[model samples]
Target: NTAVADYQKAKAEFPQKQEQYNKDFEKYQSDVKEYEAQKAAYEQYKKEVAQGLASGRVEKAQGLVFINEPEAKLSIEGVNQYLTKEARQKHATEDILQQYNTDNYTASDFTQANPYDPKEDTWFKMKVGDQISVTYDNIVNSKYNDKKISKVKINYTLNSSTNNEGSALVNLFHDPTKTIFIGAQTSNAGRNDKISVTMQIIFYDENGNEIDLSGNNAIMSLSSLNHWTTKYGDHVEKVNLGDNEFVKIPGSSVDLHGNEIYSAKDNQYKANGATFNGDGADGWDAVNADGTPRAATAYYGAGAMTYKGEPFTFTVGGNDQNLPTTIWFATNSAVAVPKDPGAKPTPPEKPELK
Candidate 1:
């Protein structure tokens, strides 16, 4: 009789336990969403603070500027596409690419703005004592969450030019000045919303030592992601970037990521996407026989440059340094030829003998 009573009682409690788990799973889903939003916001705040744009609270980055003066001709020496044309064209975002085993770049940064992790984000350097942190309320999303990661103290990794990914574009473009772009960078929030990482970023120094921030203020602000990627719209454009009709999708393109952003460690110099591709007979990326109009797009917002045929040593410390870098618009897509930055107009035949 006692055994029957125990069995009945246990059976009665099972439904409640099941129901509770159901609710817990639902909460877990919401919590994951919140975590993603928080992560994105936190990353954005880190970027803005480094740029000296956030509340003027953090120190602005250094050596970031745009050079108006034209430099030696900017030319694409070659295009070493690691991924096949089909793979690149099929994958709309890096997330999808990685999912289908097509991701040819680094890990995704949990944001659509950095789908390819082109390392476009300014690499903020913190000393051994420097500390930058953010509180994560939604830990259910972290795989280590078993699940509970209330606060993640990611270790310090040296952010140096020596850390650049061996550039696929190393010889792709050459310019005396390493321009970030030649045209404006465009942003699409709807597009970004669809892109985010399910796992958190976990990177530490090779020695596994966490370098602390050396500055007097060692903390970063607790922030939100709505400041960026807030707009919502699944919009598509008829042409490439709006206000310009020069884009030919899939014809031939490159992420406006310049040599400074992708191959910082390597000594390569190329024009940013926003740098004006000159027109006229002398203009690069020009198609017109008379050169009245051109279809060159340069990276914009923040494009820094360095001149001389010297090895590229300039580095960026902030993100969004260039936007609308998704397209490489040029009237003459066939002009990217491999050559030393020493390229010049062919000498007259008379000069060789003289």
Candidate 2:
């Protein structure tokens, strides 16, 4: 009777708990949005302030206001003069003021007749030889509770000579362990079996634009899924395999090598995903002239380099793993072909002369 009463109480509390969870999540969403908005405004203001100070002018924007000083005392020469070597290196506002006080300083140095235009900032303009950096935020989505992402999209300029023009949207799942369904033979029931796994990445051009990979025969290399899967499988087996020789906990079923097993599993996964295709692994997924997708599974060897398209599929153990996917953009896509020592030498007469 007591257990039944407790169970009933818990059942009644479920909806309340769930409602609180929903409310909390909503608040988190609202807070993050507000924070991002404020942060963006602050960054814009910071850049504006830096530019204004650099060019000798200041102005107000975004509900915040500033007036340029009629004169500025700070200069590079002043910085070198007022602050001692140690004080200059110190990260303090006081040190900055010390430098600003040096030499025949004028407040006019910090202000200008003309306002520094935001358009002149590097964020608004780029030249052919100018270096620019692109960064990506790791937020997944609101519904998923903002799973942090580690991978970034890297784009290269077309005809850069260093690379080709395409992108591989990369996704890293939480673990290699997954339950795969296998079709049964001879009227047997299909069963879900857990196994170590990997994926096949799809390639896409920028906004469905056509990418030219003919410079290197449209070939690219991807890491070996099979190799990773095998390593994962082997690690699992080794961990699951019990040996009488390894020390064991008294009266407990835990293995003493648990940490070692975990470390090994982590190492294998990291090694597998470290490179798109490393250690001489070669494969290609490309789009043809007609825009049809063509791909060959590359495992422990190179596959035919061909054309591919957006919306590529990934599978493990011949069944879909249903992992999240993203489309990447690149300015260049260059393929590298390894030289074959076994190939025949050019100018056949030279062989006879040898």
Tell how far residue 79 is off in model 1, in angstroms: 70
Candidate 2 lDDT tens digits, 204-230: 232333233232222222111222333
Candidate 2, residue 97: the lDDT equals 21
Angstrom error of the Cα, residue 12, model 2: value is 85
The Cα error of candidate 2 at residue 143, in Å, is 36
Mark the 10 consecutive residues where model 2 has the least summed lDDT. Answer: 176-185
